[PDB]
């Protein structure tokens, strides 16, 4: 380096394809397309961007409208522009690039490759930009740097990163709620993502992503997940919950953050139709356990409620009308196995499904319910037929589910019999106790 001012001149390394990273984990689109943040702010007008030797690599400039608001009198959830992160994407070429910026934006380099290790570092010099800077705990930045960055910002948005997290929030909210505690906030976010990576077995199986997860502000809705990562409403109510580093590790704020990231991390083999608001809450419960928070299933008396609806009701798991009731058996498996000598239960189940699950969409995703059962049995060498039978996993029928999309599942007697015979053929021991009776 040394080619110019800090941030305006920098050298960008290629990152692995976010889509490919997601595909390999069976999670789909959710890693940050904006990870190569510049710390450069481009005002409205004509800009010059100098690019060094590309060796023919594809590199582009992202200018997201992170401060996009609903038009006057437009109710934020009824925005014709939708809830997505709007951006300009401009292909860059080696040498001089002339770029017309219509709306002032923070700049992000998009430099992604299929051979990350064997791509050149590409210098990019924003010779007409302003240095906003960014906060990076991995660089060694402290709260002294955090305070200086917020005080000196030229943009309404400050960029920040840790090991796993990328943040793009308004300076106004960072000053009001984070105050001086930038390190604590980024460390809290990294802790909450790392809990999910651990439960996924990414640390155990050497699959921790290089790609970060972006948490962005939005001006449309409270909290959600989309293809760009997680999004939090830029109002005092929501920013107090997630931008105060004490608050985000407590109660419903910890749950909401963990739930949203849990949508990024929920794998297709554990997220068949009707599971979208179920499988991610395994992460929410684990985050609560690791942060000194009470179990939401305990607080809601969900064990009794779930046993009443599904087991006493003798209905299919697929017929349950309560996402917390559907969560109960998933968490019983974790609590039972981790306290009975299988501490890596979900890490191993998720690795097993990454390696062994099929490739199903739409009405075929119900096949994952049975692949999930098989994984749980094989990983623990335990015959869980009775557990899954009691929880209604083996009820044949035609089941309609509304879960964002419409699902029409056909669970045939042959499908149920094939799974039960596969389990029986393993000759594994049955649990000594009835795991369905587990409560907190």
């Amino acid at each position: 380096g040394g080619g110019g001012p800090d941030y305006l001149y920098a050298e960008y390394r290629a990152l692995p394809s976010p889509r490919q990273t997601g595909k390999n984990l069976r999670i789909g689109d959710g890693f940050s397309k904006y990870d190569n943040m510049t710390g450069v702010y481009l005002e409205k007008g004509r800009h010059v961007v100098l690019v060094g030797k590309t060796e023919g690599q594809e590199i582009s400039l992202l200018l997201p409208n992170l401060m996009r608001k609903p038009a006057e009198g437009v109710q934020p959830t009824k925005d014709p522009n939708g809830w997505g992160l709007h951006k300009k994407q401009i292909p860059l070429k080696e040498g001089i690039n002339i770029i017309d910026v219509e709306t002032p934006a923070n700049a992000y380099i998009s430099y992604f490759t299929e051979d990350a290790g064997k791509a050149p570092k590409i210098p990019v010099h924003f010779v007409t930009g302003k240095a906003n800077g960014y906060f990076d705990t991995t660089r060694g930045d402290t709260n002294k740097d955090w305070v200086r960055l917020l005080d000196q910002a030229v943009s309404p948005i400050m960029d920040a990163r840790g090991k796993y997290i990328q943040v793009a929030y308004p300076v106004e909210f960072l000053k009001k709620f984070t105050k001086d505690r930038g390190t604590e906030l980024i460390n809290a976010y990294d802790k909450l993502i790392g809990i999910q990576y651990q439960l996924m077995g990414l640390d155990k199986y050497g699959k921790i992503p290089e790609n970060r997860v972006l948490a962005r502000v939005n001006f449309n809705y409270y909290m959600f997940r989309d293809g760009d990562g997680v999004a939090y409403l830029g109002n005092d109510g929501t920013m107090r919950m997630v931008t105060d580093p004490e608050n985000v590790l407590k109660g419903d704020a910890c749950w909401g953050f963990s739930h949203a990231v849990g949508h990024v991390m929920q794998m297709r083999p554990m997220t068949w139709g009707g599971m979208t608001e179920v499988s991610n809450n395994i992460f929410s419960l684990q985050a609560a356990a690791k942060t000194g928070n009470e179990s939401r299933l305990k607080r809601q008396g969900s064990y009794d409620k779930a046993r009443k609806e599904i087991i006493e009701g003798e209905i299919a798991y697929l017929q349950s009308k309560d996402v917390f009731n559907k969560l109960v058996p998933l968490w019983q498996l974790h609590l039972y196995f981790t306290k009975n000598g299988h501490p890596d239960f979900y890490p191993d189940v998720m690795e097993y499904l990454r390696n062994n699950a099929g490739n199903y969409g739409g009405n075929d995703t119900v096949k994952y319910q049975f692949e999930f059962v098989k994984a749980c049995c094989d990983v623990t060498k335990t015959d869980l037929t009775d557990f899954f039978e009691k929880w209604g996993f083996f009820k044949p029928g035609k089941f309609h589910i509304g879960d964002y999309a419409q699902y029409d599942f056909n669970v045939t007697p042959e499908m149920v019999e094939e799974t039960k015979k596969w389990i029986a053929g393993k000759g594994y021991p049955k649990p000594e106790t009835d795991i369905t009776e587990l409560s907190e």
């Binding site: 689109d29 809705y221 409270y222 989309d226 909401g256």
Partner: peptide
């Protein structure tokens, strides 16, 4: 977008 929520 492809937004999964929470409605509180």
């Amino acid at each position: 977008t492809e937004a999964q929520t929470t409605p509180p």
